[PDB]
Amino acid sequence: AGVLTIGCREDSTTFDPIKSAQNRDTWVFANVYDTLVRVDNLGTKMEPGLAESWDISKDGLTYTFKLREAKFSDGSPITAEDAAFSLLRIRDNKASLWSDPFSLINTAKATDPKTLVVTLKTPAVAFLSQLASPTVSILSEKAMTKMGEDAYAENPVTSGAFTVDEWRKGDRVILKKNPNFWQAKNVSLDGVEWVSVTDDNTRMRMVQNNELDTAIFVPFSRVEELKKDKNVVIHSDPSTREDHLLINHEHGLLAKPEVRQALDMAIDKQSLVKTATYGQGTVAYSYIPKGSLYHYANNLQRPYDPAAAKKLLADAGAKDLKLNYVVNAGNEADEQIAVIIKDQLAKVGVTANLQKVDPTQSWQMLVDGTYDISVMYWTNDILDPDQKTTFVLGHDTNQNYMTRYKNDQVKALVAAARIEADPAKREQMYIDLQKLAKQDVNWIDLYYSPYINISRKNVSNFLQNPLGRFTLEEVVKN
Numbered sequence: 001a002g003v004l005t006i007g008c009r010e011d012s013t014t015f016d017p018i019k020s021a022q023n024r025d026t027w028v029f030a031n032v033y034d035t036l037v038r039v040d041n042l043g044t045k046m047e048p049g050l051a052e053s054w055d056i057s058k059d060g061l062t063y064t065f066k067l068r069e070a071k072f073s074d075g076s077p078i079t080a081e082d083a084a085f086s087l088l089r090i091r092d093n094k095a096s097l098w099s100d101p102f103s104l105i106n107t108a109k110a111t112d113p114k115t116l117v118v119t120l121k122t123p124a125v126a127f128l129s130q131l132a133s134p135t136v137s138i139l140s141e142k143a144m145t146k147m148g149e150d151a152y153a154e155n156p157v158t159s160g161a162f163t164v165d166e167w168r169k170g171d172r173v174i175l176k177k178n179p180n181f182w183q184a185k186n187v188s189l190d191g192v193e194w195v196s197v198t199d200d201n202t203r204m205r206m207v208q209n210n211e212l213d214t215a216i217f218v219p220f221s222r223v224e225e226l227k228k229d230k231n232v233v234i235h236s237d238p239s240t241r242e243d244h245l246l247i248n249h250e251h252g253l254l255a256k257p258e259v260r261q262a263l264d265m266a267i268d269k270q271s272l273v274k275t276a277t278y279g280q281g282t283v284a285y286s287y288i289p290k291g292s293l294y295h296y297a298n299n300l301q302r303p304y305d306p307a308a309a310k311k312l313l314a315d316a317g318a319k320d321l322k323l324n325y326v327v328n329a330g331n332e333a334d335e336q337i338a339v340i341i342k343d344q345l346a347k348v349g350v351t352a353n354l355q356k357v358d359p360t361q362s363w364q365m366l367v368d369g370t371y372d373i374s375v376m377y378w379t380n381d382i383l384d385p386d387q388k389t390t391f392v393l394g395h396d397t398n399q400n401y402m403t404r405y406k407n408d409q410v411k412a413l414v415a416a417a418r419i420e421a422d423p424a425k426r427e428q429m430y431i432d433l434q435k436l437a438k439q440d441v442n443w444i445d446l447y448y449s450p451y452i453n454i455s456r457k458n459v460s461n462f463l464q465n466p467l468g469r470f471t472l473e474e475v476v477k478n
């Protein structure tokens, strides 16, 4: 009691925001640190965070933030030098996964402890939306310098509602209420535990047996029956989520656009999404999630056409194509989808060999390239297409969501669209990016879907906002 347990799937890897692009981390330390700006619960606008106000230069190059009075968890104050230190290591640290979107930072300096001044190399409208991401969580410069970044990442001094009280790697992360948080008065919970439970049904049974207060990732097959269960509440929260089939373009004949186009034409999207998501998903046709900024509703959907897929593969030397399909065991959708894709690809002479793995282990296999195809997903945590575009199409250190997709026109277009000042031309550039990615088959878009989570009836205000952030500060456990 007083502690909210949350069953999750993938487990924490770090509390240093620059070192992870995964929700197993960002959804956890989003309630551990605070940010200069925040996004409201409906994901529509920016709101004050650690910064109570801000002003932008006329030349759009100087961003000045007025910090409110706030403390870190260790009692020390939150100063503009702390924020300056945080922004700049995203740009400059060797281990940062986000150097590319933050390469446009000329300087960040504190003119005085309350005032932060960031100047960019060129204007970029996304910069303010960027400051709401948990990636720009404000860390304590003094203590990072004191402890070093390796120890800080395992027991941080935090600026948000909770501290990391203990961390059993691969098992659970136990957060304790931070009494120095500037909104600590609003925080009812004494603590939060993220418990990794990699089997969907086991996670659900644990909620229903009162072994967990809440869980994320309700398996689609059970949403309907659980909605009728009086002891629990299914949440279906508006999201920026999209699921997709990754393709490793480095792996032989998968480099040929025709082979990837053939795979796209051999997978019946409507049938797949209806069967595997039990009607909860919406067929996806663009890498930008439907409802998010610049989403292009008339992007190409290749109709199911196995005859043309067979000819494309034959013309390309890939008639007998065999694929290493990495599958996350215990992820019901992942498993169901793999059976459908395997069955459908077999109709065009393609053999998908399923390799079932621990869901906590597959991401590293994507990074290392030890896969031909594998389903994964993405959620935005800012209100701008530049974050997903850079990770998925930017040709940055992440290798285009680990596909190794390469298109020189796209790489340049991503950088141009970032700094485009004309909003009407910026929109057209993100439309062309959705078009070009689809022409090339960077990956196979599968479906959009809400966040579907579950909580026992006594838990109040267990909302995940569209940017993935759980309103753990508003939660009341009755």
Ligand SMILES: O=C(CNCCO)NCCO
Pocket: 021, 022, 023, 024, 026, 377, 378, 379, 380, 381, 382, 387
């Ligand atoms: O969706 C993401 C990151 N989402 C937060 C935006 O950076 N990663 C793949 C799933 O872990």
